[PDB]
């Protein structure tokens with residue numbers, strides 16, 4: 001078997017602003033929802049915050065050198081809205097925007113394609129105080145913010161993501177409250193999901209007016225497999241699938257919301273103006289897939305609101321975040337996504353990776369992470385399998401370039417292919433990163449044998 | 450001591466309720482969704498899954514309840530208006546059917562000889578405004594003033610005593626700091642901002658009342674006095690933090706004293722400085738002030754008890770109500786003296802809520818409800834009011850919380866504060882022994898308490 005990838009297939013690594021940057025008040029940056037959330041007791045594992053993180057705002061030069069050592073062809077990163085427009089709407093902060101301006105120039109100088117994400121979960125607190133994703137005006141606030149970046153980086157950043165993972169934003173931030181802004185309401189979740197979709201479409205429209213390049217959304221899909229042949233379990237599987245995988249994809253594709261959501265959300269479900277769905281389905285140029293695992297849901301009448309719960313798949317390895325390792329499901333998901341998007345929408349895996357225990361410091365200058373290595377090589381082979389089945393896949397970004405703050409789980413969950421000692425800020429390339437650099441250099445051939 | 454309890458001329462006796470706790474009919478006649486409609490229909494938030502969807506069915510049954518007021522000899526009825534009934538989206542269109550309910554209620558009260566005492570806000574923000582940030586959005590002061598105007602004009606000459614905000618501390622401490630009440634946020638950052646905007650909204654409503662209203666307007670504060678747990682300095686510092694956060698946070702800015710210095714210690718990095726013009730707005734002169742009072746606390750140091758780092762020491766020497774609150778009537782006298790001092794002695798006060806929760810059976814027994822501890826609480830706390838008047842406090846009335854057993858917010862129907870029992874299975878009302886005594890207190894203007 002040859003694992004050589006297609007001509008032009010793009011290899012990179014990914015991060016997010018709050019998870020790596022630190023410097024939360026630097027250069028006139030505004031407060032974000034995560035600045036508040038992480039400083040509230042009880043919310044974060046071990047009381048961890050992103051105040052320092054990987055100190056990447058100050059260490060970006062060294063990190064670009066690391067990218068070159070890994071042979072990266074692209075770097076996927078998010079822009080902190082609060083840095084650029086501290087009050088969310090109104091005055092631009094030139095100092096905060098300058099950080100991204102120098103970063104982007106550094107990447108281009110290194111021969112690395114900059115892939116920017118507008119929103120990776122760090123709403124400015126000033127907009128949260130005005131209702132955040134619950135305020136329908138956020139579509140316009142978000143389009144205006146996007147315009148700042150589309151214009152500033154015109155001709156430099158050519159591949160743009162609007163929203164990273166609408167499901168986590170809404171399920172975590174509004175439905176269950178495990179993530180900022182920490183609300184727990186089905187009523188709110190329904191509305192916030194709708195405004196996230198509208199903001200995406202408004203940003204795409206603004207991009208057509210002023211931008212240059214290709215724009216799209218980034219979704220996470222967690223494929224749902226049958227727990228049994230019982231009808232009540234199939235219904236549970238459908239509910240879980242509708243709420244997690246189809247909630248955003250169907251309206252993006254012009255199919256309206258899944259019918260199952262009226263069952264899942266009950267009296268919290270709402271209907272919206274027709275014109276909203278035209279906005280939401282504004283044509284995009286590509287779509288990103290964030291992918292990590294599958295689930296096997298069974299009926300669970302007390303598991304609000306989907307009334308489903310995953311059955312632990314004890315036959316397989318599980319990561320430190322408790323996610324099953326099952327590479328065939330990545331191939332299956334790419335195939336499904338290709339079917340659902342009509343097969344003519346270019347796809348990229350914009351995040352894939354795995355968390356395993358690593359010590360807090362390098363040992364003899366190394367970090368040996370054989371299960372992360374195994375996950376990496378088996379999932380990249382699964383990608384190649386998907387390409388062989390007609391999926392128009394154009395790139396792969398490893399989550400993550402660096403160990404970082406895994407949101408409410410804190411620094412306890414390491415996804416980096418490069419280790420960060422959070423005490424010293426020393427970076428150490430892990431064995432997974434060493435392998436990945438060779439996958440890129442050989443364009444996959446290293447996996448043959 | 451030979452003690453007598455006749456009250457001053459014109460001292461006003463009544464009972465109090467709040468819209469969400471009694472009305473039911475949450476979607477009737479064009480009413481808009483409120484934050485409590487959402488909160489109560491979210492699993493885990495309410496004891497037993499109780500909601501206000503029906504409550505005491507007062508939206509339908511209000512005429513019966515007015516007859517009950519008459520049997521109690523009430524001179525006044527303190528009630529709240531549901532914002533989202535009157536202005537379903539919080540701003541914009543006024544709902545005439547929703548406003549008509551309060552219109553008929555006010556006329557019914559006047560015809561019965563009962564003074565209507567209306568509260569603009571008793572915790573039921575329209576959900577359309579919560580979706581725009583609710584008390585975190587500075588524009589809420591203006592939205593609230595516009596809502597006030599609708600009522601000030603509609604009831605001009607009929608409702609003459611007005612309350613703006615019922616208990617800022619409960620709204621913010623419960624709704625934004627700890628999340629136990631709607632809208633269920635848990636953030637010191639948000640609590641600091643919400644408290645400031647609740648104050649600004651009060652000030653804006655008073656300014657609007659000066660322009661379009663007729664009568665007397667004021668805010669209603671809850672105070673829970675904090676007493677020393679020990680002689681340890683760490684416990685006195687804890688007492689000061691608890692007292693600043695609960696009792697002075699709102700009162701000091703209302704009186705032009707700024708925020709308590711202790712709040713920088715309690716809220717730390719969540720604390721914010723605000724523009725001077727805001728404090729001008731907050732301190733807009735009022736005509737009267739309401740005190741909601743139930744109990745005291747004896748705080749000790751508790752480093753893990755966020756954010757005040759204090760916790761109450763159980764006072765096992767005294768009775769406690771079903772809500773776990775100590776029964777200690779001298780602290781009512783003490784608080785009224787303190788509040789009089791801390792308002793300069795020139796602001797008329799009324800006790801706008803006072804009362805107690807005790808177990809009652811779910812149905813009347815031979816047409817009665819015998820509630821001797823609620824009777825005890827009532828008569829000893831009314832005496833304590835009289836003691837405060839004797840110390841020079843300008844107290845002008847007393848409203849019993851509550852006219853009716855009702856939905857005790859997130860504690861549900863399990864905590865009964867009524868002087869009238871409600872059988873929630875049948876909607877039958879039965880005046881309790883506490884209500885029967887109260888009726889005689891009013892009739893005798895206190896004299897019954899002598900014997």
Ligand SMILES: OC[C@H]1O[C@@H](O)[C@H](O)[C@@H](O)[C@@H]1O
Pocket residue numbers: 016019164165220290351399406407
């Ligand atoms: O949970 C692991 C990762 O999941 C991804 O979808 C998110 O975009 C990352 O921010 C996150 O760290």
Ligand SMILES: OC[C@H]1O[C@@H](O)[C@H](O)[C@@H](O)[C@@H]1O
Pocket residue numbers: 467470615616671741802850857858866
């Ligand atoms: O908790 C007992 C009572 O406290 C009062 O201060 C509130 O205004 C009522 O709504 C509540 O039922």
